Amino acid sequence: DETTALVCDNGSGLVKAGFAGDDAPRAVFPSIVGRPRHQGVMVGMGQKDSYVGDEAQSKRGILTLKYPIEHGIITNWDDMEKIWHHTFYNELRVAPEEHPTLLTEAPLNPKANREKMTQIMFETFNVPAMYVAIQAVLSLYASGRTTGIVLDSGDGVTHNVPIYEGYALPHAIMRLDLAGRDLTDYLMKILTERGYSFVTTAEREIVRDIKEKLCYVALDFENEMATAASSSSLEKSYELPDGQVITIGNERFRCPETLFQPSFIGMESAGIHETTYNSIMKCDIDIRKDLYANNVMSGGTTMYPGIADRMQKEITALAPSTMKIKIIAPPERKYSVWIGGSILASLSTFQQMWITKQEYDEAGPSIVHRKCF
Amino acid sequence: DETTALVCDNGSGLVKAGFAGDDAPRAVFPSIVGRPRHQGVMVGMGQKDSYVGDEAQSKRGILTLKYPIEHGIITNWDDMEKIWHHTFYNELRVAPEEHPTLLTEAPLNPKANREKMTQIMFETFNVPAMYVAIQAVLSLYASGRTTGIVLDSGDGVTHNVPIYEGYALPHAIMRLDLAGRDLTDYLMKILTERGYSFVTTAEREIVRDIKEKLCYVALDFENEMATAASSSSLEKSYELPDGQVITIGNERFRCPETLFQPSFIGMESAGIHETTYNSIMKCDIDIRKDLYANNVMSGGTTMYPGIADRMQKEITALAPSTMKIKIIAPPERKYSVWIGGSILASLSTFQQMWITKQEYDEAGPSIVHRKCF
Amino acid sequence: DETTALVCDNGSGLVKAGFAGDDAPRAVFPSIVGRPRHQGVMVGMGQKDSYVGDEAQSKRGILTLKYPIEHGIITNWDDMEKIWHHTFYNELRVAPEEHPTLLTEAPLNPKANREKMTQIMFETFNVPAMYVAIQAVLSLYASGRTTGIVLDSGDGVTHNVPIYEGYALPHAIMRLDLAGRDLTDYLMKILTERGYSFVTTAEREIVRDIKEKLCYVALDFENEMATAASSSSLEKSYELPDGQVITIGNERFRCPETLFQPSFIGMESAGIHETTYNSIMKCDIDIRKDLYANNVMSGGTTMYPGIADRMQKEITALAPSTMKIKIIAPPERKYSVWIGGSILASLSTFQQMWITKQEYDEAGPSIVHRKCF
Amino acid sequence: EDGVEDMTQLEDLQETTVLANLKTRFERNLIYTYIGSILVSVNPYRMFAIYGPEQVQQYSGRALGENPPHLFAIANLAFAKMLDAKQNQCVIISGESGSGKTEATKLILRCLAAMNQRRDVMQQIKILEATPLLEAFGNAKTVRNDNSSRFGKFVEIFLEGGVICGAITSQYLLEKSRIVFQAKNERNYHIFYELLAGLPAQLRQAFSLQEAETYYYLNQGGNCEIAGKSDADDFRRLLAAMEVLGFTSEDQDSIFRILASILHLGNVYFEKHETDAQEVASVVSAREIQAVAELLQVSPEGLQKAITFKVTETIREKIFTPLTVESAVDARDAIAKVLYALLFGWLITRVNALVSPKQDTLSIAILDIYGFEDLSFNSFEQLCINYANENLQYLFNKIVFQEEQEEYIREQMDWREIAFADNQPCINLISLKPYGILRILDDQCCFPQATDHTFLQKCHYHHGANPLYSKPKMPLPEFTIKHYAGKVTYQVHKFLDKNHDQVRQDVLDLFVHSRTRVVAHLFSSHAAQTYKAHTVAAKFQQSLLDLVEKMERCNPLFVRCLKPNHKKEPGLFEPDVMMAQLRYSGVLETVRIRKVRLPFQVFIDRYRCLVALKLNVPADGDMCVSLLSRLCTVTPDMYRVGISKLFLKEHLHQLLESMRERVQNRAALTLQRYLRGFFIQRHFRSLRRKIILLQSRARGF
Amino acid sequence: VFAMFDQSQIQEFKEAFNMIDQNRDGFIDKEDLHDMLASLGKNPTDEYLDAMMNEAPGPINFTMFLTMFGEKLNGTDPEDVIRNAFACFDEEATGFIQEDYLRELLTTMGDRFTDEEVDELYREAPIDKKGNFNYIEFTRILKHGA
Ligand SMILES: Nc1ncnc2c1ncn2[C@@H]1O[C@H](COP(=O)(O)OP(=O)(O)O)[C@@H](O)[C@H]1O
Ligand SMILES: Nc1ncnc2c1ncn2[C@@H]1O[C@H](COP(=O)(O)OP(=O)(O)O)[C@@H](O)[C@H]1O
Ligand SMILES: Nc1ncnc2c1ncn2[C@@H]1O[C@H](COP(=O)(O)OP(=O)(O)O)[C@@H](O)[C@H]1O
Ligand SMILES: [Mg+2]
């Protein structure tokens, strides 16, 4: 009867899991699987062949860390099963065979990904029901709006979804394979100019922490670079795990600049502002005014200081001066997809949109293409 | 006892409804029905399958707008029922089963249209009485005259009806299938010369607004074109819903010119002035002098600035110089048909001309052919 | 004396140039201009700032490719000059200052486009004479007919032009901004369902080649989809430039289906068959029977296998069964516009229809509006 | 001796017959009547002999035969059922406010205390003294009554072989939305006005209180004073009751502090300040917030953040999200409602602990529940009220059908399965999980841009085909539900504003860490006990489910208190008022369930006119249905008359009656034309055969 | 009725009708009765005989005469019908019907008859003091003759 649904926002970098109706995810941990890369010499020490989540980062210095998801696509289907098993049993401490599960996926992913998630849910974990949602719709659900264009940016992909009065325009949906992971790689590359070498996968986590703590978005790039070159007031220090101290200057704002200039990492694509403007201009002329004032930002990559100010400046430069530009960046936008999924999964009217086990048995794994979206 | 009659002037483009005895229509809204053409992604948003009237234009950017009436003929009989239901219940807030209803129709329409309106009124809405009137007679009623020739022009049809001392000459009644909708289409076509593309049905409304706000009738076409080409003082700007600004020059007076030169839209018919002169010349020689001085103009298409001046000039050129030409264009001619219908439906002597429910039950839907006109 | 005229059919995607009187274009190459997007490190390598035509596709992997024409409108007037200079000098190896030039344009383009082409021809290249023709008339000239409705479809626009005994009906001319480029974009979008990512402008050419080689039009869409889903006999393989092999199934016929269902790419317009039927029904009742049997198809987008069969089926479904429907699709319809232009420019009676340099000097760039069409 | 006690024994039970019998009983000063085992009591507004030990011994046990109806019959019947089945039983006293349910409960409590223990009456004294506190904390003035109980009082008397142990009092179905919202011409609960009126002056200066017109939570009605009620006297009586009930001065001071904190929290306003990407509500004046913090011994900044901020708190961070004006208003109202609910629960728990029992083997339960509500303007509270009444009417109909089945098997007959249509469809229409009205309301309470109009549209779409659901013709903001008591129209005006009752964990944590012991204890207990109930409707449904779950382990007994006149005149009666009360009380549901029940001797006597019934003393095997076969070509469906005589269906009954009246007409015509023949006889053979003979004989010699 | 005849009274009934019912206009005439009375011969005079009969129901017609013969009194009034009619308004098969009960029954239902007609009936009906009217002997006397 009272079977609470499970909301699992398995992103490329973080797993956000919890119960429907809650205000925050119950379990948040990195989506990594680690394996030992050294020689075990003590008897009985070395009987574990895999580490998932936070225990993979506690043992970070002897493991090889691998991500099962790149750019929103699950490429390793055994590590993904390990991560889902960890989430269901060790983290949520719940039995999946008696809870409906709600999962999320990027708008323009291959269909085999969704079919394989459906098959794994219905055959390995024996869930009673299933649904796969689109992350931007859940961002709007969490934002308390029915009209707006969502700029979601995790660390796999960046996509734009314009929605008006609950109606989506699929032809105006954008997608970029440029997100937090590429920012971490670019910061790792440009940290070599000061003589800092981060090579292994365990140092990728240190570079990611540096990026989260120190990096920010400059309102204007050229004068910021001139100020950084003409003085030393923009430099900050960071302490490495072994006690060494590093210092970074213009690398603080040069790393997030690749979101607006993808040419830094050798991509021909346009910036996030131009992508958003292009997505808006692909909609009806009667929809554009409402979309201009409902720019909803979601994801962890949108958490840089000053990113909303620059997005508003760029859109104002692009859009006509008559329109009013608003960038909605709630302080909890890092969990907006999960919050929206929790809101949606707890609705009583939503109970008729689940993919039940009987429907799967009847129609194969392809039922998810007509039941979802 | 005191059952107030309802006057419903359902035209091709606008519905003008109200109560008999009032000085103005109670409800005026576009005669459109819209349906969603995009994909609904939010749960609970998208449960409405139709929008009628102003709510169809609020949601203009996600709907497909369709007109139930073209050229004064009802072609969609379910959308028409939806529009009538909206008018009776949501707009007038009245119960149709206790109010006689007065409807209007073009002079030379097919008989099936009138029979179907009678059947719908007497079987779906259960009105106690009914009458179908001719719009030009109501225009004369509103103008306070019994003698004159009426040039009514909505957006479906344009017709001429000469009436002398309350007697109509049916053999001199003209009809043109050229009206405001064709003007909107022609303006949409000629707006592409400056690079403005309006394609969808939602942009048809924007083009219609442009035509209403900026277009006018030139006193003489050739010198107006020469002036427009030799300078730039006739250009005006218009702001689109999303903030873009368009500019139009000679298109301001080239659009209404198709009323006097139907050859612009590929029609062999004569202009409205020549049609009026031909209708006058089909009457008795003793009627022509009075008709020449009682040219009554009605409808929304007659609302262009300078249209009366050019009509008088053209008729003076055609008619002999001895006669005196007068063009009566009251400032409220956009509602003259409704005003005349309201005047007629409130008369005490008119209570014997209704088509009662008993007469319909006795004689079928064909009673309207002998009771009306 | 014997100054041979030049026929230049500069379309949105391909330039078709040659000499009047020939049976085939002398030069056919893509209408692209490329610029380097990477860093030049060798001394002397990187002194070229632009690549036009086939040399822009040889260096495709280091350049940013841009089209000067979208939807039949020249948007970049310096790249267009570069392309015309290339055509005149490097391709045709002729001096433009001693050869009359014949150019083509879509029926309903902005007037500034034609005026600017006239100005560029008469002031930059110093041609002795000029003419701008309509592509559908040239298609009829190449087809050896004087009566028929032409469905021309390049990759910028799709237009219908009904002509009877050499007389055109301008009010029945249709235009769609849906053509080969939109088909390439839609195929690029739907290729992501199998995990194939084509992002850059250089991969647009690969997708275009895939569309040209593998795509076809299904006689009926629903049973074709059922057959494709119920088996795997409709799948074909394609080899990418670096050796990777891709496979596509229902995407082979789902891409050209947007010509008959523009709703796939989010357009409210009607299919090409309904557009052709509507254009026919806007003509005189005495013209329709001859037009029904003279449906002439022209352009590269009409080169899909099975497109003529489906066009005939759809028109037969729409048109009355009494009429006889014929779809004329000559095997060389990809060059019909150029062939017709070559036939027209070689006529002796046509020598009086050129726009001479003296007339341009007298009347400004606006002479082309009264001399042409 | 013209009236009757039990209407079950009647041969024709109709609404007119029930009204006539009830008014005949009332005119003879006979209040109580019987419907099977269901008692009906009309409030006479006059002191009647419903007491006295002689009545107790007269009704003591099964020695009376229940010839006269009385509440003592219900009491000793419940006692006998308990001693027979060794199981608990409950008595449900329903009815409108002022219809006499309260003194009915007090008389039942006195009768049980007199007949069970008869050696010690301390339990009844201890449970009667707690009544004024519950009356002050759970009643309010409505547009229909001046003192209406807005909750269901559940008194459970524990018995051990005739020994009265401690009693447990429980509350259910409390109206949460009245604390913060009142309609026109109605007040809040009496406790706030009594506190503001009768409080000592220095207490008011310490709490910074003022007159009731200033406070927002009380002045919404516009009439803060009742014409005919003294608040100070009741407040002093409440103090006396608390002193008797062991409430020390510190506890009373804490209660007054909590109530003053609620009142001051009700006076906080917000302004729409402009932020970089949103509108943020900020408190106008910090005086009220500081006053509430001081009265509740909590942090002022903590309270201001709990009012104007939303907390998203995971393991590794804690994010504060500013709220809007409406969200802040909802948070403040939810805090006030939870404070009041916790205070009431604490008072009832302390009262129960004062008279705590020892064992738990047998118990008698008394429920004082409010009844159907159909006002002029009708809204969410009455919707919940009618839902609860429908769920009780389900059990009422179950009991009535059980009695009907017992009657059908009471004598010797082949008992058939009798059809019975229960009111389950109405319950499903209101609160079924997929698309119930309350479920739609709960869904709209978290949907992004939901308002009352969208909720109405969803209801119309989902329930447009339901026979019980009805839409207005014109686009009016209302809908109609066909209850068991008739069509009821609900005005959707603030359904979403009245349903927002979400209290987050930050508020509970703030209130736990208070410097006063009672508030901290209450909130710690609440956190320990706490659930997917975030709305008023969900909590109401949970409480009603708990109440029902407490009430299937026993066979309920129903007492239906009615009202003869709205003017409280002792003797004046109206027929329309009786019809309305019978519809609302569900008494007519028995008549609806009955439709076959007609008698035997009627057929024996007054159905001989057809074929001049030849036989005498027709027996159990009498030719009765075959009579119909050979006389009226009527299908055999009337079950059996015999000894157990309940056979005739209504349409056949009317057909036979109207056949009888044609027969009477024809017989009268025959007799009258025969008598005309006799008149012509006497006329002609008088004026000739009695005159010509005399004349001829006189002429003779 | 034509089928049923009470042979005891048929002779008197038919003699009365043949003395009253003749081939005439249709109204009852004093001519035939007066001729039968004064067939021997008597001085005709109007000294004290100015009013002979005045309470006929109305005009008589041969068709209406046959209807009256078929329906009212000629060979009619089956005893079972009378007993059943009188038992319809009583619960005891004994036929003790209260006189006042029949008073209102006759004076309120059917084509209403006056108390005068009920008394007229009682001029020959034996009734007990308490009013429980019985009808066996009265019915037999009415049907056989007198
Ligand atoms: N405060 C921050 N500043 C900058 N980057 C951040 C911040 N917080 C998280 N990120 C980046 O965002 C990415 C994770 O965001 P998330 O939305 O959880 O991704 P996903 O949904 O794909 O798992 C990581 O690469 C992380 O480095
Ligand atoms: N001020 C105006 N100037 C020009 N055209 C107008 C104006 N007002 C209305 N119209 C045109 O007149 C048409 C509607 O007139 P109306 O008489 O209401 O039509 P109908 O009676 O057929 O509904 C519309 O096409 C509208 O664009
Ligand atoms: N065999 C083919 N099958 C499908 N599409 C084709 C084929 N050949 C050319 N096309 C498409 O037609 C377009 C070019 O046709 P063309 O008539 O040359 O265009 P334009 O005249 O506008 O330059 C290109 O988009 C190309 O992909
Ligand atoms: Mg009109």
Residue numbers in the entry:
A (entry chain B), B (entry chain A), C (entry chain C): 3 to 375
D (entry chain D): 1205 to 1734, 1749 to 1813, 1818 to 1923
E (entry chain G): 22 to 167
Text of the article:
To more rigorously probe whether even a minor transition accompanying ADP release occurs, which might only be discernable in more distal regions of the lever arm, we once again implemented a symmetry expansion approach for the wild-type rigor and ADP-state actomyosin-15 complexes, this time recentering the particles on the myosin motor domain to facilitate alignments capturing the distal converter and lever arm regions. This produced reconstructions with substantially improved density in the nucleotide binding pocket and lever arm region. Biochemical analysis demonstrated that the first myosin-15 IQ motif binds the regulatory light chain (RLC) rather than the essential light chain (ELC), as is canonically found in myosin-2 (4, 56), the functional implications of which remain unclear. We next examined the nucleotide binding pockets of these two states, which were well resolved at the secondary structure level by the symmetry expansion and myosin-recentering procedure. Unexpectedly, other than the clear presence of nucleotide density in the ADP state and its absence in the rigor state, we observe no discernable rearrangements in the backbone positioning of the nucleotide binding loops upon ADP release, unlike myosin-1, myosin-5, or myosin-6 (21–23). While the limited resolution in this region of the maps does not rule out more subtle side-chain level repositioning, our data imply that any major rearrangements in myosin-15’s nucleotide binding pocket accompanying ATP hydrolysis must occur concomitant with phosphate release, before strong binding on F-actin. An essentially complete lack of coupling between ADP release and lever arm repositioning strongly suggests that this step of the mechanochemical cycle is unlikely to be meaningfully mechanically gated in myosin-15. Our structural data furthermore suggest that ADP release is unlikely to be mechanically gated in myosin-15, which could facilitate the motor populating a nucleotide-free state in the cell to boost its nucleation activity in certain ATP/ADP concentration regimes.
